[PDB]
Design a protein around this ligand. Structure first.
Ligand SMILES: NCC(=O)Nc1nccs1
Length: 165
């Protein structure tokens, strides 16, 4: 199972790790993708997860969008986890760099509550522009299921742990 995680709360765990390498080692039931409404996995966590699937995640995502249309900001969809997980939960956190409502971050984390255990990144962090310290706070105050957070950046991981209330 998951190893080397620091326990933050009853159900939230954190590790300085690349989520792609973490998914390949663990092969969790659910890996969370930091998705956009179009499921266009170009950069950040999405680009890295998609590249690990040899673009199979993007091909599957384009078929999903052709059938269903775009997701809502704060929404999610369950697709295949390919070689990374049983399932991928594509969750859309607000992109602050696109002027999206930061209050949607709580709605985005609520999607995690439909899964008993997940491997996930901090929503809206990185190229999505939100404060990762705020994202971790919303995560621990919203998610009740078991979430294993992978933070790629060592310096950010240290800052998150040392500032955790
Ligand atoms: N290029 C790899 C990468 O970005 N991995 C990440 N793991 C967690 C968040 S970002």
């Amino acid at each position: 199972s998951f190893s080397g995680y620091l326990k933050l709360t009853d159900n939230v765990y954190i590790k300085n790790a690349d989520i792609v390498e973490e998914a390949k080692k663990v092969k969790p039931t659910v890996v969370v993708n930091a998705a956009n409404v179009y499921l266009k996995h170009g950069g950040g966590v999405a680009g890295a997860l998609n590249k690990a699937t040899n673009n199979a995640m993007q091909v599957e995502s384009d078929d999903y969008i052709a059938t269903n249309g775009p997701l809502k900001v704060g929404g999610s969809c369950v697709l295949s986890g390919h070689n990374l997980a049983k399932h991928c939960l594509h969750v859309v956190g607000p992109n602050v760099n696109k002027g999206e409502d930061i209050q949607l971050l709580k709605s985005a984390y609520e999607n995690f509550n439909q899964h008993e255990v997940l491997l996930a990144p901090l929503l809206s962090a990185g190229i999505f522009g939100a404060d990762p310290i705020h994202s971790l706070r919303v995560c621990v105050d919203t998610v009740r299921t078991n979430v294993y957070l992978a933070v790629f950046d060592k310096n950010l991981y240290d800052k998150l742990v040392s500032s955790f209330l």
